[PDB]
C-alpha cells in the first residue's frame, strides 16, 4: 500500500527526468564542441576567432551553471532513501554520489577555479572524457529511472 | 521547491531566476504551507501549476491536522498496553510475577505451552524478585 518509501520513489522518478534532461543537454553541448574542434580551428579572421571563443565561453558557462543542480538533486535522492530506510537503492546510489563529490572538489585542471575552463576545454582528452562520462551517466540515469518506477509499483501493489 | 526552481530557471517567464532560486523557492513553499502570504508569486503556467497543487496540499493537511486534534481533545481514549498474555511475554518494560511458593508458580514451572515457558524463563531470570510472599503484597 501507499507508504513513505513509495512517495520517495515517485518523487525521485519525477526528479530523474530533470537529470536526464541535464545529461542530454551536456551531450548536445559537447557534440557542438566537437563540431567546433574537429572542424578546422583556423582563426585567421579576427571576427571568426572572436565568435568561436565566445561560443566556447558561453557553452562552458552554461555547463558550469548546470552542474550543481544535478549533483545536489542526486544527493537529495540519497538522503531521501536514507531516511526512508531503503538500503539497497542507497547502496546503488552512494558510488555516484562519491564520484560527483570527487569530481566537483578535485579540479584536476591545474587552474582549479572552474570545473570546466574555456582554456582547458577544447582539449581532445578532456573533451572525450566528458563525452564518455555524460553518456555513461545518461545510461545510469535511465536505468535508475526504470528501477525507481518498478520499485514504486512493487511497493504500491503490495 | 526543487521543481519550482528548475521550472523557473530553465523555462523562465523572460530576471525570472534571480526570483525563484532555490532559497526563495523554499521560502515561497514554506510561506504557502503556513497559510501566510508571499513576496513573490509565479507568473509562468508551470510554476503556477506547482503552486496550485502545493496550495491544495497545504489546505488539506492543515484542515486534517486541526480536525483530528479536535477529535483527540473531544474524546478521551485510554488504551491498555496489554490485551492478552503473549503481549505480556513480548513486552520487557512491564514486569510480572506470581506469589512465591504457590500453585500458580507450580503451573508456570511445569508448563508445556510456549508462551508460559517464556514467562517462566523470564520469572526465573528476573532481578529483582518479581515473586511475592502474599496476595496483598
Amino acid at each position: 500500500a501507499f507508504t513513505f518509501a513509495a512517495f520517495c520513489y515517485m518523487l525521485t522518478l519525477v526528479l530523474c527526468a530533470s537529470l536526464i534532461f541535464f545529461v542530454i543537454w551536456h551531450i548536445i553541448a559537447f557534440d557542438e564542441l566537437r563540431t567546433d574542434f574537429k572542424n578546422p580551428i583556423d582563426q585567421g579572421n579576427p571576427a571568426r576567432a572572436r565568435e568561436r571563443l565566445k561560443n566556447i565561453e558561453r557553452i562552458c558557462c552554461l555547463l558550469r551553471k548546470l552542474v550543481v543542480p544535478e549533483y545536489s538533486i542526486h544527493g537529495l535522492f540519497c538522503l531521501m532513501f536514507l531516511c526512508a530506510a531503503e538500503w539497497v537503492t542507497l547502496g546503488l546510489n552512494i558510488p555516484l554520489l562519491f564520484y560527483h563529490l570527487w569530481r566537483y572538489f578535485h579540479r584536476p585542471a591545474d587552474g582549479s577555479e572552474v570545473m570546466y575552463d574555456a582554456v582547458s576545454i577544447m582539449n581532445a582528452d578532456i573533451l572525450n572524457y566528458c563525452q564518455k562520462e555524460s553518456w555513461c551517466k545518461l545510461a545510469f540515469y535511465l536505468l535508475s529511472f526504470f528501477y525507481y518506477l518498478y520499485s514504486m509499483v512493487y511497493t504500491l501493489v503490495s | 521547491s526543487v521543481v519550482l526552481f528548475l521550472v523557473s530557471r530553465f523555462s523562465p517567464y523572460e530576471e525570472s531566476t534571480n526570483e525563484f532560486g532555490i532559497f526563495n523557492s523554499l521560502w515561497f513553499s514554506l510561506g504557502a504551507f503556513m497559510r501566510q502570504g508571499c513576496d513573490i508569486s509565479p507568473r509562468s503556467l508551470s510554476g503556477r501549476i506547482v503552486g496550485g497543487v502545493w496550495w491544495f496540499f497545504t489546505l488539506i493537511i492543515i484542515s486534517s491536522y486541526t480536525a483530528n486534534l479536535a477529535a483527540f481533545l473531544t474524546v478521551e481514549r485510554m488504551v491498555s498496553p496489554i490485551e492478552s498474555a503473549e503481549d505480556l511475554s513480548k513486552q520487557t518494560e512491564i514486569a510480572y510475577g506470581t506469589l512465591d511458593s504457590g500453585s500458580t508458580k507450580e503451573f508456570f514451572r511445569r508448563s508445556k505451552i510456549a508462551v508460559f515457558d517464556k514467562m517462566w524463563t523470564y520469572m526465573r531470570s528476573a532481578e529483582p524478585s518479581v515473586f511475592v510472599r502474599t496476595t496483598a503484597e
Binding site: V14, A17 | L6, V7, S44, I49, V50, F57
Partner: peptide, 27 residues
C-alpha cells in the same frame, strides 16, 4: 495529485522551453 502536478509542470516547462527557443531562433 501533487506528484501528478509536479510532472505536468515539468512537461509544460519543457514545452514552453521548446516553443520559446523556436520563437527566439526565429528572431
Amino acid at each position: 495529485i501533487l506528484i501528478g502536478g509536479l510532472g505536468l509542470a515539468m512537461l509544460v516547462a519543457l514545452i514552453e522551453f521548446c516553443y520559446k527557443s523556436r520563437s527566439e531562433s526565429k528572431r
